[PDB]
Design a protein around this ligand. Structure first.
Ligand SMILES: Cc1ncc(COP(=O)(O)O)c(CN[C@@H](C(=O)O)[C@@H](C)O)c1O
Ligand SMILES: Cc1ncc(COP(=O)(O)O)c(CN[C@@H](C(=O)O)[C@@H](C)O)c1O
Ligand SMILES: [Mg+2]
Ligand SMILES: [Mg+2]
Ligand SMILES: [Mg+2]
Lengths: 379, 389
């Protein structure tokens, strides 16, 4: 019988009741907007996490690598969008997945990448499904939402080239820089409007564009309306994290992934407890540093998961985390409060970064038992 | 020659690997291994490399073949993997947690000469009571704080050293030594300050061992080291071994501390260009922070390299171009000086392969299930490494 007292530390624990509440909150919001949810599994890369998202009503998945496409397809999921601008050298891998039965969709934002796909498809007998990525907020990839000549030149390359022009997609990743409901709502409207504008421009040119796909977790939870959109992609919401708490779309109490750690020593004069969760456990992500409340390398909670405001990991080496007062003072008699061997749970800055440090999650049930749920590492 | 012809057909190079990949330039790696071992031989001290930078059996095998004595590990899973691969002299250099004692016992009962460390009377009492119960005289070293980096017993705290050392010795354990790590060396960037810190690290660790021996307690090993202080110490009188790990590859944090050049950096991430934002001067590559890690140790140093220094496919630095930003699977390649490069698409065409030098080799390596060990003939081989605990 494995439980939080028996596991070695550090371990990545998913509180299944918290995870199920986050899954239902997002699916209920997408149902209220009349759109499909295509979760981004790059947050967990774990078959049972994605199975719970499917069981609640999700439609297909988004993946960040073809390794995730291979994993999820070998587990029976066939409706897979690889939402990273396609590199031509990966075309043989993509072809072999489609010929095996995976309905794998690729994305592009240039004439040259569309040309490479379409020439390879014609040669190989494969009508690849490709969507066009639209830049709606200046974050990263994509055809500018008002760069119509580029949008139509790519769309005609794919459609006249014998490929299946399946849709447009955008990701308003600048939402991570926001922290008010008004700014998130307005960005969610800019994301929706730009993605719909590109679809209408394709359709107006006589090109197919059946899918309009938007999303980030903060804009998926903030959008007031989603007219014109067929699906939303969101991923970090399945666990949440402290970055999301500071953006304002969840509370710390909603964060379903924590790192179980043991106190292995102290520095009494500085008021430090040293734990065995360093940055190799937490990752080096320090997304909260650029936000209105800095949580260091994570927020401390007790073994029951009660948040302990005011204690955070103020520093981290590879295998040692430094727990101390966030107010800078040296806690008096820190060893008397957290004796050697005490177990604590640390909430992460960024769930996608912390999860990737572990070979598996420990999925925590209501009775206190855990089941190990493997996840993917690498490419 | 059936095996030959098939092996040739299957052989990878930097053109045929999928990206991103973590590439070890084996010539650079061997130059780093010989440099550290020669330095320690010249100092008359053993080198006990810290394998937590690579966690890879062939990398440790190269360090052992060059003359290393034992290893340091950061987790008991590293002690399990390297003992199964034939390494018997292993120091687990993280404050021992009582609940890990059954795994440390099982490793010693299989034949691993595993050493543990402590820095408190309670951890010493837990080891000694488990060892008496189980009939095992564990070997334990006392960790010393010589530069305020983390924690450890103060080198001048005779009453706490004696109490921890008597708890282990009177308890029937083998008090085997003292160790320190002057991790504050990562904040320095001059040879004068590094040499001084390495002397403070030596002096304080020997001071602790001299105090234990003055009370009649054994303390035969005195172990010091970080890569920067190993390379800078003038003298090592009284020290029996040095531990250093990131030197096997180096990285840009080390280049900035000034103990290596960018051309000594033996680990790089092979990446492909997958797109552009022409008006911002950006090339997008498939090495984001999941490949590089989120480490940004160069941001507070003399030269900020973002998420890494861009090199061409031949490994040569392309000055002025860095990964200025990174999302999980996408890295943003742009000018470090903040200008928008003109014709970025012509400077970096779609499908171009590049190599990115890491901020911190320990952090970048852990993002990969294996390295691709690049030989002089351009051939790679997959060298697995450990992930997790
Ligand atoms: C293309 C694409 N679609 C959906 C998501 C999921 O966003 P959430 O994690 O906010 O739900 C992402 C996430 N991208 C991360 C990243 O590191 O790439 C970031 C840009 O916001 C995505 O890229
Ligand atoms: C206990 C111990 N010994 C040796 C080293 C190796 O130092 P280099 O990597 O500089 O050769 C370390 C390294 N510790 C890292 C860390 O992330 O823990 C840091 C404090 O320098 C060490 O801890
Ligand atoms: Mg994320
Ligand atoms: Mg390191
Ligand atoms: Mg284990």
């Amino acid at each position: 019988q494995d439980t939080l007292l028996t596991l070695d530390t550090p371990a990545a624990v998913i509180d299944l009741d918290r995870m199920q509440r986050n899954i239902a909150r997002m699916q209920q919001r997408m149902d209220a907007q009349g759109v499909r949810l295509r979760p981004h599994v790059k947050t967990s890369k774990s078959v049972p996490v994605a199975a719970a998202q499917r069981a609640a009503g999700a439609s297909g998945i988004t993946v960040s690598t073809l390794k995730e496409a291979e994993q999820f397809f070998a587990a029976g999921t066939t409706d897979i969008l690889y939402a990273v601008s396609m590199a031509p050298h990966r075309l043989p891998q993509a072809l072999q997945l489609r010929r095996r039965g995976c309905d794998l969709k690729l994305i592009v934002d240039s004439v040259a990448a569309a040309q490479a796909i379409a020439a390879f498809g014609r040669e190989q007998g494969e009508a690849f499904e490709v969507w066009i990525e639209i830049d709606t907020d200046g974050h990263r990839s994509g055809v500018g939402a008002d760069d119509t000549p580029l949008l139509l030149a790519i769309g005609r390359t794919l459609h006249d080239g014998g490929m299946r022009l399946g849709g447009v997609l955008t990701h308003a990743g600048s939402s991570y820089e926001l922290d008010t409901p008004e700014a998130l709502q307005a960005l969610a409207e800019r994301e929706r409007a730009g993605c719909v504008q590109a679809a209408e421009a394709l359709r107006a040119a006589g090109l197919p564009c059946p899918v309009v796909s938007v999303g980030s977790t903060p804009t998926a939870l903030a959008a007031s309306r989603l007219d014109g959109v067929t699906e939303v992609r969101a991923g970090v919401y399945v666990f949440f994290d402290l970055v999301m708490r500071n953006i304002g779309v969840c509370a710390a109490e909603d964060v379903a992934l924590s790192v179980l750690a043991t106190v292995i020593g102290h520095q009494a004069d500085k008021g430090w407890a040293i734990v065995d969760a360093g940055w190799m456990a937490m990752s080096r992500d320090r997304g909260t540093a650029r936000q209105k409340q800095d949580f260091g390398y994570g927020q401390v909670c007790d073994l029951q998961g009660r948040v302990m405001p005011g204690f955070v990991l103020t520093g981290a080496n590879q295998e040692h985390g430094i727990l101390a007062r966030a107010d800078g003072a040296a806690e008096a008699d820190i060893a008397t409060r957290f004796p050697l061997g005490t177990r604590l749970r640390i909430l992460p800055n960024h769930a996608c970064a912390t999860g990737a440090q572990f070979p598996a999650y420990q999925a925590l049930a209501a009775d206190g038992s855990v089941q190990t749920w493997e996840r993917l590492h690498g490419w």
